[PDB]
């Protein structure tokens, strides 16, 4: 049993004797290495100028590396092998968690030098979906030897999008109460009541960058007023095709000269890093959906994001 | 004075006292580092693990090392600087004789590891022809320093195709019988009698590349009969658009299978480099002309060169 992503697909199984795991480890035995190899080839291909520098060439490394190490592990034959399989994808997940700051860092200045400025969004779109995808997969895969409930794997089996909301909507604001000494309340509207099937790791990633650049700009925009900002109001929208998830803000909007850059990695006008948008996108996109804004010059910005429902 | 290449110009002029060579050589000192640059970007945006083949990096030093000379080199004031920069342009024509055969060894086996095919072609095309304009440019200027007659630089104010045809027939029918006892005879019809003014630096690459290939086909097809094989037609055609140059061979054809290869760099069935027809190519259309071509399989093969002709 199964839920379709994108090329690839998340086991669901439950067999008491403990049979599924040995499915699902031998799935990721096969799957990660071809997808790790596609990655290397990535690098390979990168303008030599950029694929030198030092950062980048230790992301290189690793990558190298993870498929030595994956290549290299025996067949699994059975829960002992799983067993230490997991120990392997474990180390790996923490070897590489720090991966997409890397990248950036590698690009930063290496990407001035090349005369094709769409290439490295390409490497950067391929690379980071290609590795949620593998980090999803092996998470998920962890996943099926824990006991929690309403989870099957990655998998909630009843996901709240107002609880998952909620949860970095806090986080957002105690960042923005940080640096700034308030932060905009949040409300939410729409089909507040909710649950279905849903893994919430994409959501995990978008919903905080979503929410703290709708935060810093409210503040940015009310510097006389700290203490009285405009809320953020989200409005959700469940049918059976996606979920929706609008974010709009009153924070000024973004400016007519920013409009084509603020989905170019990179770009920032400072939370400083800009990959927040772009890595959202990907990642929307990755998925079946989609990542949207409306620029209300003066006023504020809604973001729209979508994403496709759990067939079954 | 001038004639217009792809932008850029030979400079045609006469002054006595030797004006016009300070005239070129700042202009070449202006233009020859700007050109190495772009070239030196093209090494840089090339794949990192073509790149970083020891031929691919010794070739890429070498635009380095030009670079620096060029740029080091101090404005020139008097004939005597000029005279001297002279000395610098045949030392790096010289050292950058064999590049097209360090390039064609250095990608021959680098290349199979990327995806995209054609962006060697177009590394290739760009690199080649770049560098045919260098080095006409820089020939050019050596030349206004002769005082060979019906010569202006490297243009021959009055150029015979049938006399160059010939000249390059008679060295590609020497290579061929050392290799197989024989060789075709070759035929010249249609405007045998035209002259005018030509550069004839891209006839002398391309003409043998053609002719070695005609002659390589109708004797591997006529292996039975090396003492009586069918002749190569040549037909020029002079107007007052361009100049075309017909070499029609009964070597018995490019085979449907081989058609669509032929024109890629490192191609062949075998005068061995595979690089003839698509560097004869990219240098004719470098120049506002064209290589095409025309096989009847099983007879043979109609090649069809056109060059411009120079305006004024
Ligand atoms: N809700 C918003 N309101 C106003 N401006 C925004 C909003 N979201 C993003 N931006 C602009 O787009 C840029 C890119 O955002 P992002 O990719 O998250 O990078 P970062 O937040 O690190 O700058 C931001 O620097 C900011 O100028
Ligand atoms: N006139 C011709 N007749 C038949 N085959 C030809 C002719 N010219 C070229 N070819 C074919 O096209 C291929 C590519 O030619 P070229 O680029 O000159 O490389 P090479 O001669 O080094 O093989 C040759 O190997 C040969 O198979
Ligand atoms: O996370 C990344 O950067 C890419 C994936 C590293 C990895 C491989 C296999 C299993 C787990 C993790
Ligand atoms: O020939 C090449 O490979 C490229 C040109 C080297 C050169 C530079 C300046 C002048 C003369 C020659
Ligand atoms: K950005
Ligand atoms: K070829
Ligand atoms: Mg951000
Ligand atoms: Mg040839």
């Not at 996943?143 to 309403?150: Q, R, T, V």
């Not at 959501?203 to 703290?212: A, G, N, W």
Request: aromatic share 8%.
């Amino acid at each position: 049993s199964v839920r379709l992503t994108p090329t690839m697909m998340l086991y669901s199984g439950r067999s008491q004797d403990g049979s599924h795991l040995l499915k699902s480890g031998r799935y990721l035995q096969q799957e990660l290495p071809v997808r790790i190899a596609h990655r290397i080839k990535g690098f390979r291909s990168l303008p030599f100028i950029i694929g030198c520098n030092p950062t980048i060439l230790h992301v290189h490394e690793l990558y190298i590396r993870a498929f030595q190490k994956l290549t290299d592990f025996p067949p699994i034959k059975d829960q002992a092998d799983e067993a230490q399989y997991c120990q392997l994808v474990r180390q790996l997940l923490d070897d590489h968690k720090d991966v997409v700051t890397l990248l950036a860092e590698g690009l930063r200045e290496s990407r001035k030098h090349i005369e094709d400025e769409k290439l490295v969004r390409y490497f950067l779109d391929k690379t980071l979906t290609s590795r949620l995808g593998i980090r999803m997969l092996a998470t998920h895969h962890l996943a099926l030897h824990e006991d929690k409930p309403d989870f099957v794997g990655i998998i909630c089996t009843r996901l709240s999008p107002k609880k998952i909301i909620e949860k970095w909507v806090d986080f957002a604001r105690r960042l923005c109460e940080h640096k700034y000494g308030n932060a905009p309340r949040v409300r939410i509207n729409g089909h507040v009541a909710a649950r279905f099937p849903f893994i919430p790791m994409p959501l995990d990633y978008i919903l905080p960058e979503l929410l703290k650049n709708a935060m810093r700009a409210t503040m940015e925009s009310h510097l006389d007023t700290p203490y009285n900002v405009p809320d953020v109001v989200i409005t959700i929208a469940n049918n059976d095709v996606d979920l929706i998830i609008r974010i709009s803000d009153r924070g000024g909007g973004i400016a007519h000269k920013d409009l084509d850059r603020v989905m170019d990695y990179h770009f920032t006008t400072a939370h400083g890093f800009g990959f927040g948008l772009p890595t959202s996108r990907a990642y929307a996109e990755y998925l079946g959906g989609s990542l949207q804004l409306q620029s209300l010059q003066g006023i504020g910005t809604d973001v729209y994001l979508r994403l496709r429902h759990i067939d079954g």
